[PDB]
Amino acid sequence: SREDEIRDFLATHGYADWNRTPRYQRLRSPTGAKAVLMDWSPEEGGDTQPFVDLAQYLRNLDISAPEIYAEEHARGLLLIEDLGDALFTEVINNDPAQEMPLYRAAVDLLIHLHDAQTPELARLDPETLSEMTRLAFSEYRYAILGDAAEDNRKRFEHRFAQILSAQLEGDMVFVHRDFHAQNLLWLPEREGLARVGVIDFQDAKLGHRAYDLVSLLQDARRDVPAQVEAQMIDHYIQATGVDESHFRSAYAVIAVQRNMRILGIFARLSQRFGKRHYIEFVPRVWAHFERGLAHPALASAAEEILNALPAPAPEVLERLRA
């Protein structure tokens, strides 16, 4: 059994007396030392090596990704550091005055990260970013109107790749891809940006400096105040020394890209994975999408894309949920 494998893996590496306290199974020593077991079997299609490689890479930068305590690549098992339970979302739910300082710490992580020498990961080039918006047609539009508007999509993708190519410049940086409050953990005994524990970095890519900042600040699952986004963009620009007009323009086209795709991601979470609650986030996503399409960089694509995708009226939301 898989339980026998887990027990053999733990015994082999000196953790036989540790107990599970219920992919991310909490384990505790007889005296309360903490660790986390990752169970991602190869036979199932999982691979532990990217997690190990990227956790090491981030930690080499004094970023609080988890230490690897033990590894078993062939059986798809790891034992890693437990980064605790103080999720940014929980901290902010309990005390809203922590939002700004927690978001500043996370932006400080990105600033530091973006100064780093990069690993060779697959790149989010303009063509790839454009194609990645296709979920807006194949999942969101399709779930609502019953077709994916193939011709509008091909025309949008072609124009949008050109716009992305025109507005995104500079070397690519490490991008986490799910950089938002729910995947961040507060570690208050640490110093500075090291207080930001990070998980879910394993499918990281190379991409633009604004990519993780958009996910953080336009986070569709939370109501991030406009002043948090404004001030955090200012701070990122001031701290990095990037050209302001260019970063702002890149940020706007990237916000269109990410919100458009997440329309599809959320549509599919509801329609395929039965999670209707993500549909409550669609009006927020749609608003950020529409805002970004009002940026002058998007002028050639805006009117045609808005004609092709249905606004989330109450009947559209219900059809997304049902």
Next chain:
Amino acid sequence: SREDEIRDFLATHGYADWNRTPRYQRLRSPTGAKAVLMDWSPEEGGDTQPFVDLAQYLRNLDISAPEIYAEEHARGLLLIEDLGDALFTEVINNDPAQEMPLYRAAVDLLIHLHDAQTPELARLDPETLSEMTRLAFSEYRYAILGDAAEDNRKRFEHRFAQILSAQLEGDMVFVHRDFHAQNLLWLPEREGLARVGVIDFQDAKLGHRAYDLVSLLQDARRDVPAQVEAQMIDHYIQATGVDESHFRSAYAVIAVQRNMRILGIFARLSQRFGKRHYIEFVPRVWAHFERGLAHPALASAAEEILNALPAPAPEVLERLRA
């Protein structure tokens, strides 16, 4: 080429601009950051996984084995922490007054290590320890007299396994197996036993508490003063709370075991690997062997083994060197 693989491995993990400054290749960043490349190819028969597993295990105990910065198991490459150049032997050569405090720190490492929950490594049971002395016949005796005294060896091994079984008790501990001053590195910015950097732990096993202490204190490559050995055994006994008479007896039989085997190891280093300088260490090894055979625990084996192995007279040493 292998150089192309190394360069691909470094580039992939963000180290492309690091340069080699000449298995254990020194690498330096453009601003002088340090790391060590391990090149142990599978095609050659090498495996990086035990080094990774055991380095993690030791570091989980706050023992200064090297961090793993990057790994490539399939191609047999690792990038690890550089633990520096302050080898215990160099420190003590320069300043002999450091011998006691450096050896105390190393003994403190073992004390701490032996309190740890163990991994599942192959065990140095009595039969295995006995067989491992056979190099005394197949390499040392053979190099000198032209035969391995098969009958004496079988009789010695049978009796010696019984003696080992009688004198060794308690749970097995992690044993490094090459625990001596040459494989230890001083890290003076660290605290306590963490100042003892350790390398060459990758073929570690489980064995007796005295195993690594014998290699450290009866170190055949150095003249460890009798007072260092005496006081370090006292300190180990006092700090661990082990029964004194039993530890001392275990230490004596283990000293016989390790010195007997190293007669063979050194004979073979000279005869097969052309390193005649190890033969200068044979008189020291022989003296420790003879001392241990005078322990009452060894009484049934002592006279027969001494009759079977030639004393290292000047003509014996020359035949070992030539």
